[PDB]
Amino acid sequence: RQSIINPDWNFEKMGIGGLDKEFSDIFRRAFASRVFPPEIVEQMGCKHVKGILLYGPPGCGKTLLARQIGKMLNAREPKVVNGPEILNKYVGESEANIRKLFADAEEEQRRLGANSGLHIIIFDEIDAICKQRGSMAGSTGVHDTVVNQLLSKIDGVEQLNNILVIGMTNRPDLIDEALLRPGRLEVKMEIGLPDEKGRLQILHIHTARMRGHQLLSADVDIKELAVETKNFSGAELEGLVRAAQSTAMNRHIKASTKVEVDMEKAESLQVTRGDFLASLENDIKPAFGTNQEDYASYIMNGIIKWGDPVTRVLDDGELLVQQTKNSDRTPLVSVLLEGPPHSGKTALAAKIAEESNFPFIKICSPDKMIGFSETAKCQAMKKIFDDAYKSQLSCVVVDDIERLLDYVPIGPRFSNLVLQALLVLLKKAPPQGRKLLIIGTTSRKDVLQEMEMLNAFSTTIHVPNIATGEQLLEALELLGNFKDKERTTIAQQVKGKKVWIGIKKLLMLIEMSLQMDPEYRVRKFLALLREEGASP
Amino acid sequence: QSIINPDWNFEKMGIGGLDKEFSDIFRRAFASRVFPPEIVEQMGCKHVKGILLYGPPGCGKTLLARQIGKMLNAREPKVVNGPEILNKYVGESEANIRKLFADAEEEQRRLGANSGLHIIIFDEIDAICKQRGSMAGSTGVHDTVVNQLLSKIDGVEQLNNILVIGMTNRPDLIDEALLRPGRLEVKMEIGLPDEKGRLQILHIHTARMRGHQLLSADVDIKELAVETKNFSGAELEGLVRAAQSTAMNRHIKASTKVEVDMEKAESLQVTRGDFLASLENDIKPAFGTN
Amino acid sequence: QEDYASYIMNGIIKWGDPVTRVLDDGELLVQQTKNSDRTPLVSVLLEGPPHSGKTALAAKIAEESNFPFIKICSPDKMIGFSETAKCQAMKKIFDDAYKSQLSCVVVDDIERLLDYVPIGPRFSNLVLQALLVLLKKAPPQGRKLLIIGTTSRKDVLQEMEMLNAFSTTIHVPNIATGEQLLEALELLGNFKDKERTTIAQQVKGKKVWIGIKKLLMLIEMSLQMDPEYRVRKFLALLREEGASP
Numbered sequence A: 001r002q003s004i005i006n007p008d009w010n011f012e013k014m015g016i017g018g019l020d021k022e023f024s025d026i027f028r029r030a031f032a033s034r035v036f037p038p039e040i041v042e043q044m045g046c047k048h049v050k051g052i053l054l055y056g057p058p059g060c061g062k063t064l065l066a067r068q069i070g071k072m073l074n075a076r077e078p079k080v081v082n083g084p085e086i087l088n089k090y091v092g093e094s095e096a097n098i099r100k101l102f103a104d105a106e107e108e109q110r111r112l113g114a115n116s117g118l119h120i121i122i123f124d125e126i127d128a129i130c131k132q133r134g135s136m137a138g139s140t141g142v143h144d145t146v147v148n149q150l151l152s153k154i155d156g157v158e159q160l161n162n163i164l165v166i167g168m169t170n171r172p173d174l175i176d177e178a179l180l181r182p183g184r185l186e187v188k189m190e191i192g193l194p195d196e197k198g199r200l201q202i203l204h205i206h207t208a209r210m211r212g213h214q215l216l217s218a219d220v221d222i223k224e225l226a227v228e229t230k231n232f233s234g235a236e237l238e239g240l241v242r243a244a245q246s247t248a249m250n251r252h253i254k255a256s257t258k259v260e261v262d263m264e265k266a267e268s269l270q271v272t273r274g275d276f277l278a279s280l281e282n283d284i285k286p287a288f289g290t291n292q293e294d295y296a297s298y299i300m301n302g303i304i305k306w307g308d309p310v311t312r313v314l315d316d317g318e319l320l321v322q323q324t325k326n327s328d329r330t331p332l333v334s335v336l337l338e339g340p341p342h343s344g345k346t347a348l349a350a351k352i353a354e355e356s357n358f359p360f361i362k363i364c365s366p367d368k369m370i371g372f373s374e375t376a377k378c379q380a381m382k383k384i385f386d387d388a389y390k391s392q393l394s395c396v397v398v399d400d401i402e403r404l405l406d407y408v409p410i411g412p413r414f415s416n417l418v419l420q421a422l423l424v425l426l427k428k429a430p431p432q433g434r435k436l437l438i439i440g441t442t443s444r445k446d447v448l449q450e451m452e453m454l455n456a457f458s459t460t461i462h463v464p465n466i467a468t469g470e471q472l473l474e475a476l477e478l479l480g481n482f483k484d485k486e487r488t489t490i491a492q493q494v495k496g497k498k499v500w501i502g503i504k505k506l507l508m509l510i511e512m513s514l515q516m517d518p519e520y521r522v523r524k525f526l527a528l529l530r531e532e533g534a535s536p
Numbered sequence B: 001q002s003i004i005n006p007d008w009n010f011e012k013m014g015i016g017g018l019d020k021e022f023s024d025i026f027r028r029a030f031a032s033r034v035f036p037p038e039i040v041e042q043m044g045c046k047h048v049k050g051i052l053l054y055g056p057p058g059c060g061k062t063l064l065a066r067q068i069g070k071m072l073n074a075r076e077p078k079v080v081n082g083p084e085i086l087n088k089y090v091g092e093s094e095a096n097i098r099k100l101f102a103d104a105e106e107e108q109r110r111l112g113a114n115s116g117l118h119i120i121i122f123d124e125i126d127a128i129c130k131q132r133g134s135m136a137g138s139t140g141v142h143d144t145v146v147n148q149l150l151s152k153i154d155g156v157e158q159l160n161n162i163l164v165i166g167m168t169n170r171p172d173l174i175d176e177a178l179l180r181p182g183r184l185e186v187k188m189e190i191g192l193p194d195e196k197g198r199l200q201i202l203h204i205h206t207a208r209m210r211g212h213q214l215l216s217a218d219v220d221i222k223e224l225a226v227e228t229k230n231f232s233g234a235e236l237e238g239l240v241r242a243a244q245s246t247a248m249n250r251h252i253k254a255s256t257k258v259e260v261d262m263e264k265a266e267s268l269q270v271t272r273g274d275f276l277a278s279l280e281n282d283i284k285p286a287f288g289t290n
Numbered sequence C: 001q002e003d004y005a006s007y008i009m010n011g012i013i014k015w016g017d018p019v020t021r022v023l024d025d026g027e028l029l030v031q032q033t034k035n036s037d038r039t040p041l042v043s044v045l046l047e048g049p050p051h052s053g054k055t056a057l058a059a060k061i062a063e064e065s066n067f068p069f070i071k072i073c074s075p076d077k078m079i080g081f082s083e084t085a086k087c088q089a090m091k092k093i094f095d096d097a098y099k100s101q102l103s104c105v106v107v108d109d110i111e112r113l114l115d116y117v118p119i120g121p122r123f124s125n126l127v128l129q130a131l132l133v134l135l136k137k138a139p140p141q142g143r144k145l146l147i148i149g150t151t152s153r154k155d156v157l158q159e160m161e162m163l164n165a166f167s168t169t170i171h172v173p174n175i176a177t178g179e180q181l182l183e184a185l186e187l188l189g190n191f192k193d194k195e196r197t198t199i200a201q202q203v204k205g206k207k208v209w210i211g212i213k214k215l216l217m218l219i220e221m222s223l224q225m226d227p228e229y230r231v232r233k234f235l236a237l238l239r240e241e242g243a244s245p
């Protein structure tokens, strides 16, 4: 008759946000048979579920779920196992430790029967003790003998109906297969990264005891925090709040002359938006995706509009991103950025990717794999691509294709494994209802044509060089060098012909010219430009 | 009863050229343990329980850890020297790991929120803690140790009176699950000093000699600071030691039968010659030019 | 289910007789392997230009049959595998297929299984020999087996002397006339009313050489502009990409 839920309970009390669906499913599949009137439940001949498994990347709220589940129930205190804490040196005592966890349940069932309370058991890092059988071929065979005892005790010749085991792991591909059949561990949830609304809920949970004491200034707005925080887990949001609080507190402490804390101004403590911004930009840093310090590294000197080609390229990129976002017949789209060397392909591709406001953005450059062999490169590319399949809509950049596969005109010599991996990965669509965009950059279009790699791409965009005196003058004017009269001379001897130079080389030539004494700078610049004279 | 020692000043620490790093460490790890208890209770925040230190060899990572340990008047630190926790019998390394946190749990249970800080220092952390599933732990102690440590730091039961410090030169074998905001938040890099840092180090090291008039006026410190470039903190000390050794060896006159000329030892002083000879002959920097 | 719903994504429409012809030939082959006595092993090769819908047609032909065992071996599952792993995977799939009274195996994109590149050219011999040996050995007495292979380069296979191991080859063409293009557009329901009228007026003449997949891509690319410019953009794309046979 006594209920199994505590008389005073409330979903808000526990303090977990962003996992409503997971909790609903857990409650439906686990605790639905323990709340209905006994008479109907006993008229169906159904056995209660006695197993749960939770897995996911670190910091997504698993141990919190287990702790709150344990606290919710109106049962005895759960028996927790802190990792591999059931191992002993003596022979046969490792199993005797894993067999003492079920004594009370068995005794109570044999005493009352069909009316006993629940016995909750919690396993932390189940992968520590329960692993594949036949692996870990070391010595003493203790590991293979504990899995057998656990399986035989979970369900065997003897019957138990007042137990429930919860497991948590980060590597669910190592657990034994006979421990996951329906009956041992039936419910297998999956805790993942939160969405924007989940981020808002998490932020509002951890900022509830401060607003209630006028400790938080009204200047702060939570929508901005939820927007800027991308690829953030609950732990990282809590860490950000903690860092903001710490930097707010530190202003009232004087160091370098012993530790002295002012007790007069301490009654006017406040938390400002500046503290939050500084903490965001200094200490806290996520570890899933790409960060601003990478765009700041690829787009070094910004973008300057010296001609309409830049606008044309940017508009084409905008159209492609819109198509992939809205379209549903084509979940996979590709594009190739081609042109002469020193044109500005990588910066333009990075800018196009940045201006898309996608959740997941990544850049796969060849300078992070110096000295790698073929297998290492293939594994790295596969790992980078796999994460993009676990999001909602993502973009990926593959710059300098000719370096990913080691091309050299002599021979020619290159890598076939990487070429085939690329040719296969460019035509494989992501799971149902998910969308991907790929932007590849190169400088040798004919070679790609000879490899039958130019039809795997959906389209192509051309990035040209500076090819007129007016464009050169505009670039010089925008850069901010050779001004007033010094400019006029350059115009006199340049407008009467054509030029062929990239943008990177232009900066290099300007820097080279500026090192001479003031008088011979224009002459040196003109001589350097005339040396770099060519055409298609 | 603040955790801070009743007489502690940064000048007595003996560390020079690391002002910003120490300021950040103090702000992030020791700011919430000195504020009035009531305000911190109202805020409802948990303290940080992890620090990592990395950089090129010989730049002052163990000195900083030792001085931090000596700063706090709360018990004494518990040190772990390399792989000091490793046994052959099955299920004994983890038993060794579980004994480090016993007193913290016992005092937390008995007193609650009126406990004292407990420190644990892990020299060469990458000797035992490493990425799981990468190193071939045939026996299986390596993975199991990492799992035990992870489950003991942040697990079902909550602790609030511990602090763990780790020092490593290779900060990439470390597990990704141990470097998240929950477990180990503050991570710092110790790098080579600049001119002002070198001057501070040289002033710190040659302090007792100047007190006893054992330094001649011929030697200047600005020239020493300028002339030495890309010197780590462990090489200025070696230079000073070599200069002193030469100066003392000047007086001793013995080849076969040891003999000390006490008469000449009455007036001992070190000149520029010793420093120049040591610079030319003895000390060879690793990040400099030869 | 995953493979079936991932290969035949946008269904199969009827833009001309060739679809019906190919389906009928596949059904005849399935019937032949169902009730044969002297020929327990039958093979067929679907051949055509790129972007013509060969994988979808092969999967549909397999589905029309109700054989208890059906499998598709594709390179999507062998990214980064050395030739030894490829041989082992193929051997395991066929060995599993050898334990039933009826079976059907699809080998799509052969040229991506041999790791073929036209510079030299370079490929792998272990996989080629395994495939040449597995197309000729019969299953244990009283059993049947059907193998459907897909390729986009017939000449390469002919040079390696693989086109004789198969039993027959069936050709899969692409749109080659204005009537077919207009019917395909009508069955899709993308351009309608006066837009289709002007498209039909312009298309007449010059023929066309566009496959179904490329047509589906170009129809989606054009619908990202304003209503007044969609027809012109579509016509420009068709004129440029269309190329010639």
Ligand SMILES: Nc1ncnc2c1ncn2[C@@H]1O[C@H](COP(=O)(O)OP(=O)(O)OP(=O)(O)O)[C@@H](O)[C@H]1O
Pocket (backbone or CB within 6 Å): A298, A299, A300, A301, A302, A303, A304, A305, A306, A310, A341, A342, A343, A344, A345, A346, A347, A348, A400, A443, A503, A504
């Ligand atoms: N309008 C612009 N477009 C592109 N890059 C620009 C522009 N204005 C300035 N830049 C700067 O010029 C440099 C372009 O170099 P980038 O890395 O894009 O060259 P690249 O084409 O990838 O060369 P490489 O042949 O060496 O691979 C970057 O610093 C970019 O910031």
Ligand SMILES: Nc1ncnc2c1ncn2[C@@H]1O[C@H](COP(=O)(O)OP(=O)(O)OP(=O)(O)O)[C@@H](O)[C@H]1O
Pocket (backbone or CB within 6 Å): C007, C008, C009, C010, C011, C012, C013, C014, C015, C019, C049, C050, C051, C052, C053, C054, C055, C056, C057, C152, C212, C213
């Ligand atoms: N009658 C049809 N026949 C085939 N595919 C059709 C037909 N009508 C519509 N489609 C769509 O066209 C798609 C054609 O793509 P598919 O993967 O079959 O091409 P493919 O010839 O294998 O390409 P690739 O040469 O790149 O391997 C089919 O998946 C289906 O979505």
Ligand SMILES: Nc1ncnc2c1ncn2[C@@H]1O[C@H](COP(=O)(O)OP(=O)(O)O)[C@@H](O)[C@H]1O
Pocket (backbone or CB within 6 Å): A015, A016, A017, A018, A019, A057, A058, A059, A060, A061, A062, A063, A064, A202, A205, A233, A234, A235, A236, A238, B154, B182
């Ligand atoms: N969904 C969530 N809702 C509220 N807080 C969360 C959530 N996820 C994580 N947190 C916060 O981050 C921490 C998560 O730690 P925990 O979940 O135990 O790590 P792990 O899941 O890797 O074992 C908790 O202290 C909690 O305050």
Ligand SMILES: Nc1ncnc2c1ncn2[C@@H]1O[C@H](COP(=O)(O)OP(=O)(O)O)[C@@H](O)[C@H]1O
Pocket (backbone or CB within 6 Å): B014, B015, B016, B017, B018, B056, B057, B058, B059, B060, B061, B062, B063, B064, B201, B204, B233, B234, B235, B237
């Ligand atoms: N910042 C510093 N200030 C004063 N002395 C230093 C400093 N850095 C290094 N030293 C000296 O150099 C030595 C450094 O050794 P140690 O701290 O063990 O280096 P590490 O632990 O980084 O290998 C110490 O003996 C110390 O006296």
Ligand SMILES: [Mg+2]
Pocket (backbone or CB within 6 Å): A062, A063, B154, B155
């Ligand atoms: Mg946990």
Ligand SMILES: [Mg+2]
Pocket (backbone or CB within 6 Å): A345, A346, A399, A400, A441
């Ligand atoms: Mg580039």
Ligand SMILES: [Mg+2]
Pocket (backbone or CB within 6 Å): B061, B062
């Ligand atoms: Mg040391």
Ligand SMILES: [Mg+2]
Pocket (backbone or CB within 6 Å): C054, C055, C108, C109
């Ligand atoms: Mg295909």
